Structure 1
Amino acid sequence: AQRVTFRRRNPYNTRSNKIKVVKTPGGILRAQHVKKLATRPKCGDCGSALQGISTLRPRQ
């Protein structure tokens, strides 16, 4: 029943900033910004997800 909001400069509901709610060791509900999920690499001929290759961000 405790209300939380964004922790960064962007105040709008954009795909860039998304919020999860977690209970901290202090006993309170707090917001946490979640990063964009990674995408599986795709085959260059048929476009299906490649098997046995890790799914990470471009720089990871």
Structure 2
Amino acid sequence: AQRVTYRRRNPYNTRSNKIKVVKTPGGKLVAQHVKKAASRVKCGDCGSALAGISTLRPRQYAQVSKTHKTVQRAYGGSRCANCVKERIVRAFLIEEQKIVKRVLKEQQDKEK
């Protein structure tokens, strides 16, 4: 079986020196150097991976258009769908409850 060598001066099996073995059209078996895997973009509230967002090494996000980096919704590429829904309902219910505290206080003030 054909055996391979590193194509760079680094001789150690580090995180940045991983290789894949490929067969060329010359019939040769060569080592090919592999870039590090990308991680998912994650929600800023719950930490889950966001749907609809491309998985890229961070410098590569400056090359793709805006539709691969966001979702058409409030907080689109930042927070997931469920945490956006949960922010909206919480904002509505609390601000309604604030009015119930304000109006009730006046009645407590008025009744005495």
Q: Shorter-normalised TM-score: what interval?
A: over 0.9
Q: Which runs of 5+ in 2 are unaligned?
A: 61-112
RMSD: 0.7
Q: 1:57 offset after TM fit, Å?
A: 1.1
TM-score, length-normalised on structure 1? 0.94
- Letter in structure 2 aligned against 1:20: K
- Letter in structure 2 aligned against 1:29: L
Deviations 1:18-59 (A, max 9, x none): 011111000010010000111110001110001111111111
TM-score, length-normalised on structure 2? 0.52
Higher strand share: 1
- Letter in structure 2 aligned against 1:49: A
User: Does 1 or 2 have the higher relative contact order (CA < 8 Å, sep 6+)?
Assistant: 1
Identity score, percent: 88
CA–CA distance in structure 1, aligned partners of residues 13 and 34 of structure 2: 13
CA–CA distance in structure 2, aligned partners of residues 53 and 31 of structure 1: 31
Size of the alignment, in residue pairs?
Answer: 60
Moved over 2 A (4+): none
- Letter in structure 2 aligned against 1:44: G
1:58 maps to 2:58: yes
CA–CA distance in structure 1, aligned partners of residues 2 and 51 of structure 2: 44
CA–CA distance in structure 1, aligned partners of residues 57 and 8 of structure 2: 22
